[PDB]
């Protein structure tokens, strides 16, 4: 009954625009809870406080309180679960994509999720939201990584950014499409998400076909499909490469490389890794 009241006194000070006083008041109160090891109370107070600073466009204060929240999360050994992550998701929503500390805040959140879960690289559902924020700030390469390590929805969002990015390119080509497409094939092969690899390929190639009307014919054998392009050998290689990796058969991998000598050189590093992961080619 007392907590609801101090958060009202606080959001009064925030409507009034007394941001220094509000921050000051909240810190006294939060500190007292932290000091007495009353972590649930600190967590509720701090998070709520951070939220209203962010809603009030006070990026600095809100971001500081997010770090404070993460400190308490760590102190109270708050495990990654739905409630834990939702607090952070609700906060990520209010973050201006231009916040000077955006990347730090996101790394803070992710790092908590690594420490308190069994994911080396962090909770996927959290990654889905983080990814979107990063992209708003034009942090394209960081968004890519978080989406890659995200959910099904992230896969859709990943395809969309890549597709939008290809469309932004003024001087389209043969090698240009592959520069983007190859990223889906490789990244999802690297994390052994074959399903996302296939589904992203499908979405992407359909959109490519419907917009650019390339010359193609679908070759179908035993329930598998290669879209054979007339002018995109790159695209053929990348599709066959995926299915080859599924078989884990070195001879198919060798055949494939022997036929496309140039692509073997072009994707040298990527293929050495795939050879290790799917083949057994450690040196």
């Amino acid at each position: 009954a007392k907590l609801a009241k101090t958060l009202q006194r606080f959001e009064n000070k925030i409507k009034a625009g007394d941001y220094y006083e509000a921050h000051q008041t909240l810190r006294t109160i939060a500190n007292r809870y932290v000091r007495s090891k009353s972590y649930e109370h600190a967590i509720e107070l701090i998070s709520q406080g951070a939220l209203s600073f962010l809603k009030a466009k006070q990026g600095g204060s809100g971001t500081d309180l997010i770090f404070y929240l993460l400190e308490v999360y760590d102190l109270a050994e708050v495990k990654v679960d739905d409630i834990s992550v939702a607090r952070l998701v609700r906060l990520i929503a209010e973050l201006d994509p231009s916040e000077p500390n955006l990347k730090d805040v996101i790394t803070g959140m992710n790092n908590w999720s690594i420490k308190f879960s069994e994911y080396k690289f962090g909770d996927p559902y959290l990654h889905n939201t983080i990814g979107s924020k990063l992209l708003e700030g034009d942090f394209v390469y960081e968004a890519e990584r978080y989406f890659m390590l995200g959910t099904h929805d992230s896969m859709i969002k990943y395809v969309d950014l890549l597709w939008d990015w290809l469309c932004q390119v003024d001087d389209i080509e043969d090698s240009t499409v592959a520069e983007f497409f190859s990223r889906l094939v490789f990244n999802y092969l690297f994390i052994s998400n074959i399903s996302f690899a296939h589904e992203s390929k499908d979405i992407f190639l359909e959109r490519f076909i419907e917009k650019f009307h390339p010359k193609y014919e679908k070759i179908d054998k035993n329930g598998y499909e290669i879209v054979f392009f007339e002018d995109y050998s790159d695209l053929n290689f990348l599709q066959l490469l995926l299915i080859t990796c599924q078989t884990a058969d070195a001879s198919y991998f060798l055949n494939l490389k022997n036929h496309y000598l140039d692509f073997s050189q072009a994707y040298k590093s990527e293929l050495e890794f795939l050879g290790q992961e799917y083949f057994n080619e450690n040196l």
Binding site: A1, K2, T6, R9, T25, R32, S36, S38
Partner: protein, 304 residues
């Protein structure tokens, strides 16, 4: 709602069943307990109040000028306030003579005091609506509020088999805690003086209580001089002392912005008997104003 520098809302509350009073070290604790009890009894004539001390010094008997003990007695001059003085350590020790885990000693001690209260209500047909607990100055008497948690973890990790006993004790404490952690049923009023050591000890007490999930948002600050205002400005000693008191009052105002911080005047003669205690107690309900109320304080001293 802006937080008034008095105990008015507590004094007229109809919901509280347990009011704890605590403070270490010559800070006017007993006077404060007595004053809270009197104010509640006077403001709520239709309710019956119990003031209980667990100090062995028999401080309430000294304060009212009558002999109290293990059996509840109405304070003479009141229709609706009763006093008790017990010693739970002595009660436990006699019990134990008749033959590792924190909070146990305190749990069993406090169950004993609850037992005695309930028994006292039974054998006099008057059940008390609210108990004002003048807590012992030493020890961590409410540490048992942490027990249910400590013991639950103990049971997971898991001759007389004591598991049943442990679970019963856990359940007993959890029942208490349900009410002691309910801010509408139970609160702790801190008592202090405007000095570094007392302020430091009060921050410690408050943090201790927050860790128990006990409601605390009341601080009585005693022994305030208000020296600039009395007149007979004589006494620069008092004026200098007041300057130091104001320094720590400022610290309190900033640290405890959301608390009822009730600032009580120093009275020369230590206050004893119902009459003097009720006159003084009124300033818990409506703030002492040094300009206007000085003559009330001087009446007490003048009377001696």
């Amino acid at each position: 709602l802006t937080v008034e520098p008095n105990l008015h809302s507590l004094i007229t509350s109809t919901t509280h069943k347990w009011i704890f009073v605590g403070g270490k070290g010559g800070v006017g604790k007993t006077t404060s307990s007595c004053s809270i009890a009197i104010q509640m009894a006077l403001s709520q004539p239709n309710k019956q109040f119990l003031l209980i001390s667990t100090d062995p010094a028999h401080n309430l008997s000294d304060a009212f000028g009558e002999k109290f003990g293990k059996d509840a007695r109405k304070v003479t001059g009141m229709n609706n306030l009763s006093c008790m003085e017990i010693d739970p350590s002595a009660a436990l020790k006699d019990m134990n003579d008749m033959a590792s885990i924190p909070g146990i000693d305190e749990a069993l001690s406090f169950m004993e005091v609850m037992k005695h209260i309930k028994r006292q209500e039974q054998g006099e047909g008057e059940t008390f609506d609210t108990v004002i607990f003048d807590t012992a100055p030493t020890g961590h008497t409410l540490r048992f509020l942490q027990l249910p948690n400590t013991l639950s973890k103990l049971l997971e990790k898991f001759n007389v088999d004591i598991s049943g006993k442990l679970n019963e004790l856990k359940a007993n404490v959890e029942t208490i805690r349900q009410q002691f952690t309910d801010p509408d049923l139970t609160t702790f009023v801190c008592v202090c003086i405007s000095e570094f050591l007392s302020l430091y000890e009060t921050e410690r007490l408050i943090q201790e209580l927050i860790s128990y999930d006990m409601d605390v948002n009341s601080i009585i600050v005693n022994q305030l001089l208000f020296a600039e205002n009395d007149q007979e400005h004589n006494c620069k000693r008092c004026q200098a002392r007041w300057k130091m008191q104001k320094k720590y009052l400022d610290q309190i105002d900033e640290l405890y912005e959301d608390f009822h911080v009730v600032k009580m005047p120093l009275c020369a003669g230590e206050i004893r008997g119902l009459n003097n205690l009720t006159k003084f107690s009124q300033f818990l309900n409506k703030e002492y104003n040094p300009i206007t109320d000085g003559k009330v304080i001087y009446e007490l001293e003048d009377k001696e």
